Design an enzyme around this catalytic site. Sequence first.
Site, short mmCIF file in Angstrom:
data_model
loop_
_atom_site.label_atom_id
_atom_site.label_comp_id
_atom_site.label_asym_id
_atom_site.label_seq_id
_atom_site.Cartn_x
_atom_site.Cartn_y
_atom_site.Cartn_z
N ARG A 94 0.68 -1.30 0.01
CA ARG A 94 0.12 -0.03 0.06
C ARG A 94 0.70 1.04 0.09
O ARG A 94 1.91 1.38 0.68
CB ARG A 94 -1.12 0.04 1.33
CG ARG A 94 -1.77 -1.23 1.34
CD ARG A 94 -2.55 -0.73 2.72
NE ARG A 94 -1.76 -0.91 3.72
CZ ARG A 94 -1.80 -1.76 5.07
NH1 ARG A 94 -2.68 -2.32 4.91
NH2 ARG A 94 -0.86 -1.36 5.68
N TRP A 128 -0.28 10.29 11.33
CA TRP A 128 0.02 9.44 12.54
C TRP A 128 1.23 10.10 13.40
O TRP A 128 1.07 10.34 14.38
CB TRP A 128 0.50 8.14 12.14
CG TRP A 128 -0.51 6.99 12.96
CD1 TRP A 128 0.10 6.43 14.04
CD2 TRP A 128 -1.66 6.51 12.58
NE1 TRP A 128 -1.06 5.63 14.36
CE2 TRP A 128 -2.03 5.48 13.47
CE3 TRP A 128 -2.43 6.67 11.43
CZ2 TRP A 128 -3.05 4.64 13.31
CZ3 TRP A 128 -3.65 5.62 11.64
CH2 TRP A 128 -4.05 4.85 12.32
N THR A 141 2.06 -6.84 17.82
CA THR A 141 1.70 -6.87 16.50
C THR A 141 0.94 -5.57 15.92
O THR A 141 0.78 -5.24 14.99
CB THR A 141 1.02 -8.03 15.79
OG1 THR A 141 -0.02 -8.24 16.49
CG2 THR A 141 2.08 -9.07 15.80
N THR A 142 0.76 -4.93 17.06
CA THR A 142 -0.13 -3.40 16.91
C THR A 142 1.21 -2.44 16.44
O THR A 142 0.96 -1.46 16.06
CB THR A 142 -0.58 -2.88 18.13
OG1 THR A 142 0.54 -2.54 19.12
CG2 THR A 142 -1.48 -4.02 18.87
N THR A 143 2.56 -2.84 16.63
CA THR A 143 3.68 -2.16 16.43
C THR A 143 3.74 -1.01 17.40
O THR A 143 4.63 -0.01 17.22
CB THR A 143 3.57 -1.43 15.06
OG1 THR A 143 2.74 -0.50 14.82
CG2 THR A 143 3.20 -2.82 14.04
N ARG A 161 -4.82 -2.39 20.28
CA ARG A 161 -5.13 -3.85 20.06
C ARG A 161 -6.74 -4.41 20.17
O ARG A 161 -7.24 -4.78 19.18
CB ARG A 161 -4.34 -4.79 20.98
CG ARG A 161 -4.75 -6.33 20.73
CD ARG A 161 -4.10 -6.73 19.52
NE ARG A 161 -4.79 -6.44 18.41
CZ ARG A 161 -4.31 -6.39 17.17
NH1 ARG A 161 -3.02 -6.61 17.03
NH2 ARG A 161 -4.93 -6.03 16.28
N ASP A 189 -8.94 -2.22 17.74
CA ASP A 189 -8.53 -2.67 16.40
C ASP A 189 -9.58 -3.90 16.18
O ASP A 189 -10.36 -4.07 15.35
CB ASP A 189 -7.51 -2.69 16.04
CG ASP A 189 -7.24 -3.69 14.75
OD1 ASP A 189 -7.65 -4.72 14.72
OD2 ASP A 189 -6.43 -3.14 13.81
N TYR A 204 -10.41 5.07 14.71
CA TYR A 204 -11.59 3.93 14.64
C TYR A 204 -12.75 4.53 15.34
O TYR A 204 -13.75 3.81 15.92
CB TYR A 204 -11.15 2.89 15.49
CG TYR A 204 -9.90 1.96 14.79
CD1 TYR A 204 -8.73 2.55 14.78
CD2 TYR A 204 -10.02 0.91 14.00
CE1 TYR A 204 -7.62 1.89 14.51
CE2 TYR A 204 -9.07 0.15 13.37
CZ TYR A 204 -7.84 0.54 13.73
OH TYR A 204 -6.77 -0.14 12.99
N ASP A 250 -18.04 0.13 11.21
CA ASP A 250 -17.30 -0.30 10.02
C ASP A 250 -15.94 -0.05 10.02
O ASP A 250 -15.22 -0.76 9.00
CB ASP A 250 -18.15 0.32 8.88
N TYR A 298 -14.34 1.97 8.92
CA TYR A 298 -14.62 2.80 7.95
C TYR A 298 -13.29 2.77 7.24
O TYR A 298 -12.45 3.29 7.84
CB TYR A 298 -15.02 4.20 8.27
C1 LIG Z 1 -3.60 -2.92 15.58
C2 LIG Z 1 -3.14 -3.15 14.54
C3 LIG Z 1 -2.20 -4.22 14.41
C4 LIG Z 1 -3.36 -2.35 13.40
C5 LIG Z 1 -4.06 -1.12 13.21
C6 LIG Z 1 -3.66 0.25 13.66
C7 LIG Z 1 -2.12 0.57 13.44
C8 LIG Z 1 -1.40 0.38 14.76
C9 LIG Z 1 -1.71 1.05 12.31
C10 LIG Z 1 -0.25 1.46 11.95
C11 LIG Z 1 0.55 0.42 11.55
C12 LIG Z 1 0.75 -0.36 10.14
C13 LIG Z 1 1.60 0.53 9.43
C14 LIG Z 1 -0.04 -1.24 9.58
F1 LIG Z 1 0.05 -1.47 8.22
C15 LIG Z 1 -1.12 -2.21 10.30
O1 LIG Z 1 -1.75 -2.97 9.50
P1 LIG Z 1 -3.22 -3.30 8.99
O2 LIG Z 1 -3.77 -1.88 9.86
O3 LIG Z 1 -3.43 -3.10 7.32
O4 LIG Z 1 -4.01 -4.55 9.69
P2 LIG Z 1 -3.54 -5.70 10.87
O5 LIG Z 1 -1.88 -5.64 10.72
O6 LIG Z 1 -4.11 -5.52 12.34
O7 LIG Z 1 -3.87 -6.87 9.91
MG LIG Z 2 -7.62 -7.34 14.51
MG LIG Z 3 -2.51 -5.69 7.28
#
Ligand SMILES: CC(C)=CCC/C(C)=C/CC/C(C)=C(/F)COP(=O)(O)OP(=O)(O)O
Ligand SMILES: [Mg+2]
Ligand SMILES: [Mg+2]
Length: 535
Positions: free
Chosen positions: A251, A260, A388-390, A428, A431, A507, A512, A514
Amino acid sequence: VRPVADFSPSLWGDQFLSFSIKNQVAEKYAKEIEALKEQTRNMLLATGMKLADTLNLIDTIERLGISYHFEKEIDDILDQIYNQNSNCNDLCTSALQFRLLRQHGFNISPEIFSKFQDENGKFKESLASDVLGLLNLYEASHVRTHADDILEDALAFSTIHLESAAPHLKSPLREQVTHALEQCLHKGVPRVETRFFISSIYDKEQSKNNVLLRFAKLDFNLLQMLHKQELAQVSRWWKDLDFVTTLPYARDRVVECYFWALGVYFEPQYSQARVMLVKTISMISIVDDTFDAYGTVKELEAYTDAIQRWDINEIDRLPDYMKISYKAILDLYKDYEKELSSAGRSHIVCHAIERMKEVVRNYNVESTWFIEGYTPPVSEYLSNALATTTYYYLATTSYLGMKSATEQDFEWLSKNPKILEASVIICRVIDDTATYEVEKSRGQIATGIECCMRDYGISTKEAMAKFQNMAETAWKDINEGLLRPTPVSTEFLTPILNLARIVEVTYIHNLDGYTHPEKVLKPHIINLLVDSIKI
Ligand SMILES: CC(C)=CCC/C(C)=C/CC/C(C)=C(/F)COP(=O)(O)OP(=O)(O)O
Ligand SMILES: [Mg+2]
Ligand SMILES: [Mg+2]
Ligand SMILES: [Mg+2]
């Protein structure tokens, strides 16, 4: 074969690719701001001001997004207010005094709200017709801690009545109340709430103070110029990498990433930190896509190991595309080390690195659970899903560019302090509530709400409700963690706070989630990085 590439282009194009500051205007603004800055200061240092007027003054300056010029003056005033702990007897001033102090670390007693409740301990219904009082109580109810059960019903109380009176209030108050019901001040992104306050509220206040209003509009527009330069600079950087063509599965959301970073800190002194932070968020975005939207179980396994070993020599051990990613990651950190050399702070860069390795390990685990169709217990889920939320990673990253960050600060952060954990949980949990449906329909049965349901044997509704209280408890923890004495200076706590604020804002729509990209953020990006406040 590979998965079908869905991710659409950046609806931004090159709007930000190049921005040239209008120095004439910049200096003009700066020069006048300097004057307005001193006028405002003298407003704060003025003697003989009533309690209500002093608080309103601090509150207004904060909402105007210009309080970062008076960190000391404001502190001295609030400190003094805290100690003389005199008692004003109206809801409005007490709720405001409570909020401002608590947000500043002063553990003022919630006993100040006793005179507003009955024997039974509930707020006197007779306050339902005091809008300004209800409004400040509302904003205050959001900064409570685990020891403020006295304010247990403050939110529902103020909410029900604010909703009821709103339709017939005069403007801008009406808009201020309606906005607060959608987004409390304490949990909103500072620039976003400042943009809204300045142009939708204060600019329409009959009693507005012109000096403060002008100061606020000029400062916001001036900082915006800085932000646009940074985003431009960072946009060129992203273009040079050209992952849009080399890594087509990834992306392009550098603009959203900058937003952010801007939410973490907006002050000009954090310009370097911001640039470093957005580069990291963008980079870790590629890795995420790579893990759950392209790479195979085998490639990811090699990618993870390459990251743990962390040495260019491993690049050949990876497939061609993962080589582009990998090489870019290493060089980035090599750039950070070069940027901090000047101030001899390259030795902290490793902390951010160990945190990235942690994120990659957990991503890999995440996919392994996906492949096996594993549905862990909540505890095991969180032991992995939290990182994994980073967030541990972004928090660590945000310190890199902060001139004042020391090894001690990073050491404190490395122990996963309660304030940081709370911020991570909020991300976490929020999300998982927002992305449950989608992930669920993609076979990601190792998703939060899922684990919660199977684990506890409860409906999706009870599971999300369970997650809400976690987010709630977490907010209380964050509020507690900001109370003095703080383990590190507040300057290093605010970014954790802001990360949690970003969550609530991205969020706001659980109905949704969104499409995070376009919807939700687009408006804010336009308001903070495209349109200047009309003077
Ligand atoms: C709580 C999480 C892990 C993600 C959503 C909120 C956050 C901190 C976003 C910033 C981290 C980044 C750059 C992603 F791509 C995050 O990836 P994704 O938003 O496309 O979705 P999944 O990794 O949860 O599958
Ligand atoms: Mg999730
Ligand atoms: Mg993802
Ligand atoms: Mg993922």
